[PDB]
Amino acid sequence: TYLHHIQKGKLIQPFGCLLALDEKTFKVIAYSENASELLTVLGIGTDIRSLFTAPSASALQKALGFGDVSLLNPILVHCRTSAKPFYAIIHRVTGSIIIDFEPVKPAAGALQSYKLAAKAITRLQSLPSGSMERLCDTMVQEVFELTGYDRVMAYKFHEDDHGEVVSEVTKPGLEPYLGLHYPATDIPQAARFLFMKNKVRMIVDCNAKHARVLQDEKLSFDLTLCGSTLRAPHSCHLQYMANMDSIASLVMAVVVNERKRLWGLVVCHNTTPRFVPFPLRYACEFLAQVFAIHVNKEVELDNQMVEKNILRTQTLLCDMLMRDAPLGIVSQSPNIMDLVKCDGAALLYKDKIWKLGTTPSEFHLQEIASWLCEYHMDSTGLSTDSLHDAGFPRALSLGDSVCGMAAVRISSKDMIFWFRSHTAGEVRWGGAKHDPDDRDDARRMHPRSSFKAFLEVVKTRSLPWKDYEMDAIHSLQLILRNAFDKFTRIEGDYKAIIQNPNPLIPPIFGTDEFGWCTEWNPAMSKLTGLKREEVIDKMLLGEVFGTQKSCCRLKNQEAFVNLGIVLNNAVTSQDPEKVSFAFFTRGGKYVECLLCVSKKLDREGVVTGVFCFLQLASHELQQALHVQRLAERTAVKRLKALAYIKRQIRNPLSGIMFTRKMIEGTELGPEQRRILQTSALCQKQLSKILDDSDLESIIEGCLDLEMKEFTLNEVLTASTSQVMMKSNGKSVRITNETGEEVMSDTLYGDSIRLQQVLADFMLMAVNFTPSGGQLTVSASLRKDQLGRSVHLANLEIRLTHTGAGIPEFLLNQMFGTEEDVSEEGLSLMVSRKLVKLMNGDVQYLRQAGKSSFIITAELAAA
Amino acid sequence: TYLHHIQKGKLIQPFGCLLALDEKTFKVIAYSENASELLTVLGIGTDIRSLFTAPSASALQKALGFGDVSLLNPILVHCRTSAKPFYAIIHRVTGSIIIDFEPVKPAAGALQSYKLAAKAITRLQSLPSGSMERLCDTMVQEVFELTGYDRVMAYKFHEDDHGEVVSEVTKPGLEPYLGLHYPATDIPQAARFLFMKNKVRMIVDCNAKHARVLQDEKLSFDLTLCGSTLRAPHSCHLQYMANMDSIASLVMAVVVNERKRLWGLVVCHNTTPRFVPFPLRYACEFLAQVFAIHVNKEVELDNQMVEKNILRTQTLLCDMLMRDAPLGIVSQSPNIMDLVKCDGAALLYKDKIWKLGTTPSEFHLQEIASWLCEYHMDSTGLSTDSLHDAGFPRALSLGDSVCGMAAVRISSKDMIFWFRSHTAGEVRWGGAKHDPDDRDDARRMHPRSSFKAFLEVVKTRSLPWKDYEMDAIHSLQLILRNAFMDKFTRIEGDYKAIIQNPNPLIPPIFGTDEFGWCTEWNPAMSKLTGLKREEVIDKMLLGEVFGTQKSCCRLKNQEAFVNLGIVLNNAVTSQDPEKVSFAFFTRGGKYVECLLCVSKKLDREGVVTGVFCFLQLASHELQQALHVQRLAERTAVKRLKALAYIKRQIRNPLSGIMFTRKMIEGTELGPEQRRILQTSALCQKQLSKILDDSDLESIIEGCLDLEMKEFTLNEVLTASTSQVMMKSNGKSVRITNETGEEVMSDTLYGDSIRLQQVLADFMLMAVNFTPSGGQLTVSASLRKDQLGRSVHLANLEIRLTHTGAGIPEFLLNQMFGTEEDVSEEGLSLMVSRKLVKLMNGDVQYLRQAGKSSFIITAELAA
Ligand SMILES: *[C@H](C)[C@H]1/C(=C/c2[nH]c(/C=C3N=C(/C=C4\NC(=O)C(C=C)=C4C)C(C)=C\3CCC(=O)O)c(CCC(=O)O)c2C)NC(=O)[C@@H]1C
Ligand SMILES: *[C@H](C)[C@H]1/C(=C/c2[nH]c(/C=C3N=C(/C=C4\NC(=O)C(C=C)=C4C)C(C)=C\3CCC(=O)O)c(CCC(=O)O)c2C)NC(=O)[C@@H]1C
Secondary structure (H helix, E strand, O other): OHHHHHHOOOEEOOOOEEEEEOOOOOOEEEOEOOHHHHOOOOOOOOOHHHHEOHHHHHHHHHHHOOOOOOOOOOEEEEEOOOOOEEEEEEEEOOOOEEEEEEEOOOOOOHHHHHHHHHHHHHHHHOOOOOOHHHHHHHHHHHHHHHHOOOEEEEEEEOOOOOEEEEEEEEOOOOOOOOOEEEOHHHOOHHHHHHOOOOOEEEEOOOOOOOEEEOOOOOOOOOOOOOOOOOEOOOHHHHHHHHHOOOOEEEEEOEEOOOOOOEEEEEEEEEOOOOOOOHHHHHHHHHHHHHHHHHHHHHHHHHHHHHHHHHHHHHHHHHHHHHOOOOOHHHHOOOOOOOOOOOOEEEEEEOOEEOOOOOOOOHHHHHHHHHHHHHHOOOOOEEEEOOHHHHOOOOOOOOOOOOOEEEEEEEEOOEEEEEEEOOOOOOEEEOOOOOOOOOOOOOOOOOOOOOOOOEEEOOOOOOOOOOHHHHHHHHHHHHHHHHHOOOEEEEOOOOOOEEEOOOOOOOOEEEEOOOOEEEEEOHHHHHHHOOOOHHHOOOEHHHHHEEOOOOOEEEOOHHHHHHHHHHHHHHHHOOOOEEEEEEEEOOOOOEEEEEEEEEEEEOOOOOEEEEEEEEEOOOHHHHHHHHHHHHOOOHHHHOHHHHHHHHHHHHHHHHHHHHHHHHHOOOOOOOOOOHHHHHHHHHHHHHHHHHHOOOOHHHHOOOOOOOOOOEOHHHHHHHHHHHHHHHHHHOOOOOEEOOOHHHOOOOEOOOOHHHHHHHHHHHHHHHHHOOOOOOEEEOOOOOOOOOOOOOOOOOEEEOEEEOOOOOOHHHHHOHHHOOOOOOOOHHHHHHHHHHHHOOOOOEEEOOOOOOOOEEEEEOOOOO | OHHHHHHOOOEEOOOOEEEEEOOOOOEEEEEEHHHHHHOOOOOOOOEHHHOEOHHHHHHHHHHHOOOOHHHOOOEEEEEOOOOOEEEEEEEEOOOOEEEEEEEOOOOOOHHHHHHHHHHHHHHHHOOOOOOHHHHHHHHHHHHHHHHOOOEEEEEEEOOOOOEEEEEEEEOOOOOOOOOEEEOOOOOOHHHHHHHOOOOEEEEOOOOOOOEEEEOOOOOOOOOOOOOOOOEOOOHHHHHHHHHHOOOEEEEEEEEOOOOOOEEEEEEEEEOOOOOOOHHHHHHHHHHHHHHHHHHHHHHHHHHHHHHHHHHHHHHHHHHHHHOOOOOHHHHOOOOHHHOOOOOEEEEEOOOOEEEEEOOOOHHHHHHHHHHHHHHOOOOOEEEEOOHHHHOOOOHHHHHHHOOEEEEEEOOOOOEEEEEEOOOOOEEEEOOOOOOOOOOOOOOOOOOOOOOOOEEEEOOOOOOOOOHHHHHHHHHHHHHHHHHOOOOEEEEOOOOOOEEEOOOOOOOOEEEEOOOOEEEEEOHHHHHHHOOOOOOOOOOEOEOOOEEOOOOOEEOOOHHHHHHHHHHHHHHHHOOOOEEEEEEEEOOOOOEEEEEEEEEEEEOOOOOEEEEEEEEEOOOOOHHHHHHHHHHHHHOHHHHHHHHHHHHHHHHHHHHHHHHHHHHHOOOOOOHHHHHHHHHHHHHHHHHHHHHHOHHHOOOOOOOOOOOOEOOOHHHHHHHHHHHHHHHHHHOOOEEEEOOOHHHHHOOOOEOHHHHHHHHHHHHHHHHHOOOOOOEEEEEEEEEOOOOOHHHOOEEEEEEOOOOOOOOOHHHHHHHHOOOOOOOHHHHHHHHHHHHHHOOOOEEOOEOOOOOOEOEEEEEEOO
16 A cells, blocks of 8 residues: 555665664664764664754753654754754654654744744734635735745545645746646555644655665664655655656645634745755644634535524525415516525416526426426425436527526426526546546556646536535425425436435414413424414413413513514514524423514404514624624714715715806817816716725625726826825925827727726826926837737836835735735725736836836727 | 502503403402493403403403413403403403403504504614613614503612612703602512512502502402502602603603513603503513513623723733833833823822822822821822722822822832723703612601702712722732732722722733743733743744644634744734734633734844733624624725725726817907806816715714805806706706896805805706706896895805706705605705705795705705
8 A cells, every 4th residue: 555655664865864772772773864964873773963063952852752853843953073054853753753853944832833934824814704715825825935835736635535726826937727626546645644643745856865764673663754754755746747848846735623624725836946944834724723713714604694594594484484386486676596505486376387587488397397297206306406407308499598496396297497507517637537437547557648738628517515505405395285395406416315314484372462372393393392272262362471470481570571672573574583482392402593473464454463483593693793783873873964965975076067068069179178078087086986885895896897988098188187186285396198099999898997997097196206206107009919810919108206215014915915004005905906807916116216017908808 | 569569559540441351260359440431241250251242252262361461451342331442451461351341432462552662662672782872862862652641751770779860851941850869768678579570660640539449358368559550659759740740651661671670660741641551561561571571682792892991901011021121111102191090190100209190289299198108007099089088197288189099009119000080970950969878768648848959969980990990900010010918999989998909910921032932931920821930941843832633722723823923923024902802722621712913022122022912801792793893894994995996996987178278269269269168267266175075974973164255146056957857858858047147146145066066966856856857947046125135245046946746855854854764856956955055045845836946955055
């Protein structure tokens, strides 16, 4: 096996010395070949104190007999002959305690080494939780500057033990490996087992004259070098790295629960032999642990969202109970589409179909019913990843517009559909497509010699239907049957995997106008142990949910008062009110749930009682809303100011609109009419900025552009108009030099947003240009040198000024370098991002003592 | 006694009839004289089914069998003779059941009764917590409009059982009772015991001639009337109410926990006889229960505020440990004055005195030091509310500047003092001072006839010294004495020499060196951890003292180990204290959840030499208070930065519009061109003024400063018209100014932008709700002859006009503040309401037949 070969390896990488001391007599029994030429007699049986100085021996011996030596590493020792600084790393092996010596090429202890990554941890913790891509990208970015390798990657393991690169930052000029998939056999289980114990592997150069550990034959024990930091990599990996042209590597390890699972590895490559000091490697261990800490939060947050999707679906399902059976679930605002994520829905009732979105034709839906009625008659529901895989003869007749389906037969020949469109199943492989039946074998020596990308075309399929999604469809099926259980799941392989669902209806209990209980759901009975008959007429507040001598017991008197308040506030507002409910069951179980209480309305429209139900949220979920509940009104109390300001700023903006519009009627000067056109564009800048409520609403998401005709002559004129008043006041000379043929180009990009981006960028030069200084604006389409045959475009704007350049603090705050942003540099961060959405990036460069804003943009048009 | 007299009372108020039925045979065992004339034959042995209609009798019979009959009260019944409505109040007594009937003079059950207080409940929960005065003030307001009594009071019970009025709202033209104290003799302990059972007690007529309840059953059981709502008030209290001139009363008992203590009472008075229907009385019971819960919450917040002060004192004390010298404890702003709430503090150290704040003279302080040197040798501390009470021979010389003092014996001659100034101890009694030697006497027949306020002057003392404040300064004993068994003498209230043992508040402290080994382990830490300092010194704090496995103190998991390392390294970089959570397992198994404060330790040479970690032990409720504070702060800094970007990026296009207007001027413009330009001018200043005064923190709750600028009336109408002309011209409504040519040409001086801003949104609110037809007319008037123009003032009247039904009042009343719903149309009017109101004017809607009109009158000068 591979593990047996790795643990029996007797070769070490020629960048250090490995001396092993006996556990009992505390003298060397094994040594590396290069020890004599690097530590200076090196013969076996000489105490280490002979080969070092007095402070080194005392420091080593004190930690030699320590309990756990992991934290004391690294240890700075000096040789007796020349006192050349060495780093000593000590790990204990049952055969002999092994010390690895690493020269200190021109931080002692675990805590001091962790300080090297302190700047990286403060960047990971100060991150918006929720997005795993941002967490992965910021971790690879930190390692890139922390270790200084040519290419840093985040290799994430999937369920099939194969991996995919989720993020990558490299030096410019290197081919990107982002998105590539690699076989599971590339990293065997021997390496996966050791990565949970070593957690850091470093290779200085894949072509090195390996040294030999010449342990004496008199040693009864089988000394192991698996845990050492100097272990020579296997010959297959040396050729594997040579094929990828990665001479040096530093592979990290991420373990979710330090149950425990190797989430992935952080791979740092280098085309040249690279050496990294041990404190940095130890620091990377801490950073990986912090990364694994935050990874476990993202999976928890994902688990919270899937719980909120169930809760939101439960809220929707209760609403569909009150609505009319055949047509109520369609006419209202929350449709059947909101129940299950879909691109369309249909409802075949009374030989009539109620299309609700991107659904097949009316004729085609009838043929869907014919296929369902015979091929899958036994099952009342069906879910298919792809309709062609199911066996539909005319799957291709309706095209690739829709390929998934989740249909349940409520009654007779009436069925309700749920259509899902296809997804881009394009996956790129690293040179070998992983397959389930491949297994690691020790006979293989040379790996694949080609690493070119493989484009594996996956058959046309939609997203797989989630397990919780299927119960939501089944829950509506129960609702519709009453208002008037085997499910087929053709997913993946062509196998009719029959399943039964779990009803997702919430525990529902109702009250009449006076207070007597009226309804008691079976889900309510199973949660509390009280049958429907025993709580069918007793008062809810007093006898059913009461403090003393009650069928269900509340915690204290506050619960009694709180329950009565909610049951009375329901009549005032029909909208559901969410409150925390807790009570004891007949068996003494303490349950914590979230109570939704809403009015019950009859056909006449009068209050006929209260319809309420509980949401069985988890303890972690309950605290999430409860904490947010303390600041829930902040979205209303504070929104008054934003709504008032936006409303109060809109009134005189309209006054500006009416005033200048009427000017066009009157007689105007020949060149004077041009002010109206410039003023109109600036006016539209106010209109669009008012629509954008917050910058925080665009940084995490994407601020959509505008597809409109647009000429470059006006925007530069409009952008200059904003900054002339500042420039004319504090003297600043401004000139524009742009292509005359570009005025008639009439580009298809956004005009108001690009004007805004250039407005503050041009303001930047004015605020830092000395009196009388210049300010040049340029433009260059360069349509003949970017491949305009394939529909694309290019753009560039230059902003040069005098004044020895702008200060560093304002300049550094762009590109998300410094976390804190000033009241002045935040706009530049938004402005820089606003051209990132335009496939461009702004840069700075100082030439001849001048400045330059190299802002680039691309016009994605067709 | 008083309780014995009440328990054997056979009189009831002539406001209803009382019928007592036996438990088994259900026959009338007792009745009142008024029953025959109110329920019609009637007598003992009469079945109650023969007094009402069949549907009503069965409803009563159903309630008689209910286990908890307080739920079904009240019950609406009708007499069979004439179907006269009645309310049945039922309560169970061991001897027999008692039924109270109440006439109905033009909600059945407890739930529907609570609906009458639903409006009052929502203005108690939606209250910003922190002060009991606001909660007490609003609760009195709820009962005032609900019950409609002449006056409503909040009577708080103090420790000595005497009461104090803490809140009061009355009908206009009364004598306020706020702040008045009343002796505990007024409310006997017998009445307090009954209030824990009968929450609400009502007296209708003070001079009513009670009708005796006849009971000639010759049975063993004695019929008690304590629980009946019809019970006759005691003879003494009947004369007690006559002196107060309060015929009717409605007292509500407030019990904090239902440990169970009567917090106080809510008293309602009415000069005329008053009747409150039972549902409102039951609703008042629910309101008291909600008030009781909120009172406990206010107490809990007050208790947490004390804990925060202890944590603040603990954090301050840790700084004094690192502070250099007894000279230094004065220099830095975290001085002794912040340690204890005091008006002054003086430190005596080696024949030199340092004073901070309001302290006595140099010479008097020396005698103060000499006074303890000859009076209180045994005690090392002192605490006197008043120095005159303590025994200073020259106490009067110090004056009112300093009256109280806390003293500390740092050394034989070293002393450090604190001073508190005299506080105005004004308490007004109701007419009889309450003395502790007063006991309830059952033989008393007439109460006091004088209720005028009697003012008792309390002796000149200071604020009462708290237990933790004397503890805080004792914690300074150990810190100062160590860096250089005991008794503390307290003089409080009556002259006494109480000796108490203080328990020092020094928090647990542990520190490490630059490598990781522990350097300190406080005795407080040893008690909490169970580990002696000997077993922790010279051992790694991370991994050997605090660690997951094989460690002295066991962390919960790898989460704590990583987090502890982060805070121990961020402290070196960040000198400021870091507030993080910390949990660890004591060797005894205790899971100590606490907060960790880490600050780097600086040597005298200025080089870092480790960390200084101390713990703030906080309850499970205090920790979440800071946790939600950060999350409340989590969206706080974001909106400031988000608004500062929207505000900054709207200013730039405004400068562009300003520049275009400044350049549209040209060489010269036509007669109308500059006029239409002028309308654009004042419209732009409205854009700038709104941005400068954004977020409306002042115009909504304060007196925003206005601008007095030479103004002309004619421009304000035209500029404000164009803002609303866009929507008006486009739709069916029209705008036509009323003839004011003489007065518009006439000049009045005011704030153009502020008046136009108010006028602009008032017209837009009009055009919006004009029902797609009719004309809008705006008029004006200048008043300088009708009002005195010799006062250098003038009156301006602006009158709008509608053509339609009229804006709804439930939205119009929102601008006056009566209504608060989610509709921005009323929000804008309310904010502008104070803006004109700031101009010594008012705004008034004036309804009419065809032409609904506004009225915007403001005070304008010249
Ligand atoms: C030999 C025929 C087979 C083999 C054996 C093998 N592989 C490892 C360890 C690693 N393999 C890795 C693969 C990658 N390297 C990359 O750069 C990328 C993607 C960009 C991948 C997927 C990685 C990483 C490791 C860990 C490196 C390390 O330091 O251990 C080993 C263990 C080496 C050792 O002696 O310790 C072995 C025996 N790998 C093959 O690809 C073929 C099938
Ligand atoms: C009789 C010699 C003594 C006495 C007896 C007494 N008092 C009560 C009940 C109350 N007395 C109250 C006093 C106040 N009333 C007020 O309006 C104010 C302040 C504004 C005060 C301090 C109050 C209140 C009550 C409770 C009234 C209720 O709800 O019942 C009683 C019990 C009456 C009964 O028959 O139940 C008795 C026996 N009070 C005196 O002042 C004299 C000394």
